[PDB]
Amino acid sequence: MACPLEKALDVMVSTFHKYSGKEGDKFKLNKSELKELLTRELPSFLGKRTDEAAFQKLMSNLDSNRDNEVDFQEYCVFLSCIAMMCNEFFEGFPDKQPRKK
Amino acid sequence: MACPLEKALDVMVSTFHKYSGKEGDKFKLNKSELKELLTRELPSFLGKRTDEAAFQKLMSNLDSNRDNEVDFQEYCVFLSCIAMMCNEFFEGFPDKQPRKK
Numbered sequence: 383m384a385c386p387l388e389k390a391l392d393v394m395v396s397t398f399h400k401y402s403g404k405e406g407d408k409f410k411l412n413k414s415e416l417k418e419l420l421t422r423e424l425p426s427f428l429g430k431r432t433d434e435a436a437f438q439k440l441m442s443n444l445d446s447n448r449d450n451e452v453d454f455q456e457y458c459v460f461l462s463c464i465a466m467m468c469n470e471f472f473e474g475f476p477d478k479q480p481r482k483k
Numbered sequence: 484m485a486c487p488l489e490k491a492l493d494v495m496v497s498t499f500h501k502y503s504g505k506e507g508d509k510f511k512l513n514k515s516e517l518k519e520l521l522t523r524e525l526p527s528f529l530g531k532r533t534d535e536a537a538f539q540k541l542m543s544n545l546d547s548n549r550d551n552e553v554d555f556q557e558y559c560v561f562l563s564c565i566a567m568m569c570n571e572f573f574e575g576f577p578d579k580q581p582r583k584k
Contacts, residue, residue: 385524387494387498389491390491390492390494391565393487394488423486423488454563454566458566461559462559462563465555466555469492469496470493470496
């Protein structure tokens, strides 16, 4: 357990590989899968009840402007947005997008 | 083990919290810590020998233009860049920055 970050990196990649098993293409993910992959890997334990609108914001992000593919980075940007949305801080911080700025 | 991604998210946040213990401010991380935090949490097991220049690129990123603070997202952008740099693909893919594009 000297370097658990390595497996956690593996957890993000290993879990991601499992979803690619449903379709077959592991070189890319569809933003719609962000909705299904988000709840399938994080159902109530995330959208339990705190900041329910945030789930809709992630869903509304798929409806942002021109959403179509998920690169390894886009899935992480969404996961990172999910972490800041609620990683451990008790303060309800919205997405990384500014309000008036 | 139904949802290991939750702990892995905790692994990134828990390990990150441990480094904040060295200084004291957990609301931000210094890009220099990216160099020390990168090797301290991922020493040889990463810069083992494959794509050694990549470590210098991460280090050169701190020397990019105006580097000073690491937001939760910047640390993840660097971690995401590290994952794509070598998450599981055997192809040596550089950073997420394009070459001529």
